[PDB]
Amino acid sequence: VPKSIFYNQVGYLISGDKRFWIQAHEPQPFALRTPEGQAVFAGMTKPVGGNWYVGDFTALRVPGTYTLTVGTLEARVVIHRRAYRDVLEAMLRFFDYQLCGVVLPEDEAGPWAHGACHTSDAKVFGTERALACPGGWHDAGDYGKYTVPAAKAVADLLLAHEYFPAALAHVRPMRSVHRAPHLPPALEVAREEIAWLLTMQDPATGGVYHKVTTPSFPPLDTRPEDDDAPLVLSPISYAATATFCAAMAHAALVYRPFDPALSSCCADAARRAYAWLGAHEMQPFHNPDGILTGEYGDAELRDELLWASCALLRMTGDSAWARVCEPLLDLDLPWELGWADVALYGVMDYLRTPRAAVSDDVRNKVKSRLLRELDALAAMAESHPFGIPMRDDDFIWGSNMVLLNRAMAFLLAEGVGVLHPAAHTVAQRAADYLFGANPLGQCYVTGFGQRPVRHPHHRPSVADDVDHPVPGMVVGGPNRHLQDEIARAQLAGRPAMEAYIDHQDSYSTNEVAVYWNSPAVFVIAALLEA
Ligand SMILES: OC[C@H]1CNC[C@@H](O)[C@@H]1O[C@@H]1O[C@H](CO)[C@@H](O[C@@H]2O[C@H](CO)[C@@H](O)[C@H](O)[C@H]2O)[C@H](O)[C@H]1O
Ligand SMILES: OC[C@H]1O[C@@H](O[C@H]2[C@H](O)[C@@H](O)[C@H](O)O[C@@H]2CO)[C@H](O)[C@@H](O)[C@@H]1O
Ligand SMILES: [Ca+2]
Numbered sequence: 001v002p003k004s005i006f007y008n009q010v011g012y013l014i015s016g017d018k019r020f021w022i023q024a025h026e027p028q029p030f031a032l033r034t035p036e037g038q039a040v041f042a043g044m045t046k047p048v049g050g051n052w053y054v055g056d057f058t059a060l061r062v063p064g065t066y067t068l069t070v071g072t073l074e075a076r077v078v079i080h081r082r083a084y085r086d087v088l089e090a091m092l093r094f095f096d097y098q099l100c101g102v103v104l105p106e107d108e109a110g111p112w113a114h115g116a117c118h119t120s121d122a123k124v125f126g127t128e129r130a131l132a133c134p135g136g137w138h139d140a141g142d143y144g145k146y147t148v149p150a151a152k153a154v155a156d157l158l159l160a161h162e163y164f165p166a167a168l169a170h171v172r173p174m175r176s177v178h179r180a181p182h183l184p185p186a187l188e189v190a191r192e193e194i195a196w197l198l199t200m201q202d203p204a205t206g207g208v209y210h211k212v213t214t215p216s217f218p219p220l221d222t223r224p225e226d227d228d229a230p231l232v233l234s235p236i237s238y239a240a241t242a243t244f245c246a247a248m249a250h251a252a253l254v255y256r257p258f259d260p261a262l263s264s265c266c267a268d269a270a271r272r273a274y275a276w277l278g279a280h281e282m283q284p285f286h287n288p289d290g291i292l293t294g295e296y297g298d299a300e301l302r303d304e305l306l307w308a309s310c311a312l313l314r315m316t317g318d319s320a321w322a323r324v325c326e327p328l329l330d331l332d333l334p335w336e337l338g339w340a341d342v343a344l345y346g347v348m349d350y351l352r353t354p355r356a357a358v359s360d361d362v363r364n365k366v367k368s369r370l371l372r373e374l375d376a377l378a379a380m381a382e383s384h385p386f387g388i389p390m391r392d393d394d395f396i397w398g399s400n401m402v403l404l405n406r407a408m409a410f411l412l413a414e415g416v417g418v419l420h421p422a423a424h425t426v427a428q429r430a431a432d433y434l435f436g437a438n439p440l441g442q443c444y445v446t447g448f449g450q451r452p453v454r455h456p457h458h459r460p461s462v463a464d465d466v467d468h469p470v471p472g473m474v475v476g477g478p479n480r481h482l483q484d485e486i487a488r489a490q491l492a493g494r495p496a497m498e499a500y501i502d503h504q505d506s507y508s509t510n511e512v513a514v515y516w517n518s519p520a521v522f523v524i525a526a527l528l529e530a
């Protein structure tokens with residue numbers, strides 16, 4: 001914990017809420033000054049519990065770089081019209097930096113450029129059958145491409161495009177690595193993953209392979225193009241087939257006015273996947289022998305079927321689908337945004353379907369439960385010193401995604417008549433926390449803030465002779481379970497929010513992932529929208 005001011009190290013929006021935190025004993029006066037030193041705003045800090053005091057300077061609407069002064073402490077804060085444009089663009093460009101089997105030229109990628117990687121055909125596990133499944137994204141700090149988390153990353157980007165297209169219009173991805181005519185930014189980026197996902201479906205049965213990876217993780221010091229181990233397609237899985245179905249049905253809708261051929265192809269692929277679901281058992285995935293890469297296992301598969309059923313309901317607008325959706329909507333499944341518990345994606349597709357196609361009575365029950373869920377998140381946020389909807393027990397592996405998915409839920413609900421008053425405050429607080437407003441004063445995104453992430457568990461950043469890591473990567477964040485050797489040795493006994501270390505070997509607190517950037521893209525685009 002540093003002895004300083006804790007604030008949003010990226011900046012504050014002219015019209016947004018503006019807050020800073022300090023560990024203090026009592027209220028103190030504070031001032032905001034122009035770079036010369038003249039006071040422009042003054043106020044008194046107020047208690048928020050657990051050693052914390054806050055200062056609110058929301059009413060300062062003049063853009064600029066200000067010196068915030070409290071006690072003997074100083075901080076430089078930025079107020080701007082589009083304070084989050086650069087970070088949103090870097091968070092979206094991260095997916096292009098993760099591209100597999102694609103030359104990333106220096107004019108686009110800069111020092112983090114590299115040649116086409118993993119270009120060989122993959123072998124179907126337990127067969128001699130080879131299959132070409134290039135493209136898409138390296139999942140995270142490793143090079144595997146896993147279907148289940150890929151579905152979440154795609155759905156989050158499609159949702160961000162559906163909700164906030166104007167915010168997204170101001171950002172530029174690695175445009176020259178993508179096919180022309182160029183689509184809106186989130187759609188152009190997500191199409192690379194959608195194209196790869198289509199190659200993961202077995203033409204014979206409609207089933208989808210769980211993942212394509214090397215048999216084991218290569219050393220942390222491996223460049224993408226030096227990873228020459230043979231590629232293996234792990235068996236078809238129910239979770240993969242169901243999450244693929246839902247992501248493809250969602251992409252068929254969203255791409256309809258932009259890429260008709262892709263849209264039609266995704267719609268056909270989603271239906272064949274749904275036919276596979278109806279003919280096979282809900283069997284959890286487990287790594288086969290000799291496969292040591294990310295398992296993405298899950299014993300509960302009704303939420304995946306719920307999402308797949310609701311996605312096709314909205315895709316077709318056919319009331320026939322509501323017969324399967326509605327009983328699944330009644331289950332005591334957690335209503336979350338993945339990667340393992342995905343029911344809220346289905347709830348959203350259901351609630352976004354024209355009313356005439358669904359039971360009004362079920363629809364009202366669905367909306368009421370969503371409001372109760374958001375009230376419970378609002379209560380967590382009210383008791384948190386940083387105003388984020390988190391409890392100490394939520395600081396697990398990928399706790400930043402847990403936070404962002406929760407902010408995302410409030411924002412999504414606004415599109416379906418569920419208007420919680422805390423929605424915008426929660427989104428701002430999630431961004432503030434992600435950008436430094438936390439007990440470690442840590443900005444959880446590489447290349448941004450005054451205390452950026454410098455040593456992520458990310459093979460390209462470790463392996464290159466740059467690190468100085470690839471920018472715009474959201475790290476997993478604090479995980480109280482100490483799920484790596486560095487966390488066990490250096491973070492024992494520390495509070496849940498302090499269970500993070502910016503060390504390359506801390507994969508349980510400091511890895512990056514396509515499905516950790518995807519809710520951040522949604523949340524940051526929502527704030528930029530306003
Ligand atoms: O670390 C990011 C990913 C890097 N690519 C390999 C993937 O396998 C890895 O995924 C992560 O894999 C972890 C190790 O299996 C998953 O961690 C688990 O996260 C769970 C909650 O998401 C915790 O309950 C559980 O204690 C913890 O083990 C975590 O969610 C999930 O993001
Ligand atoms: O737990 C999965 C985690 O593993 C990381 O690879 C580790 C590997 O598990 C360990 O056995 C070996 O000694 O070290 C490597 C590199 O630290 C992998 O890089 C992560 O993507 C993954 O989440
Ligand atoms: Ca599940």
Ligand SMILES: [Zn+2]
Nearest residue numbers: 100101117118
């Ligand atoms: Zn690759």
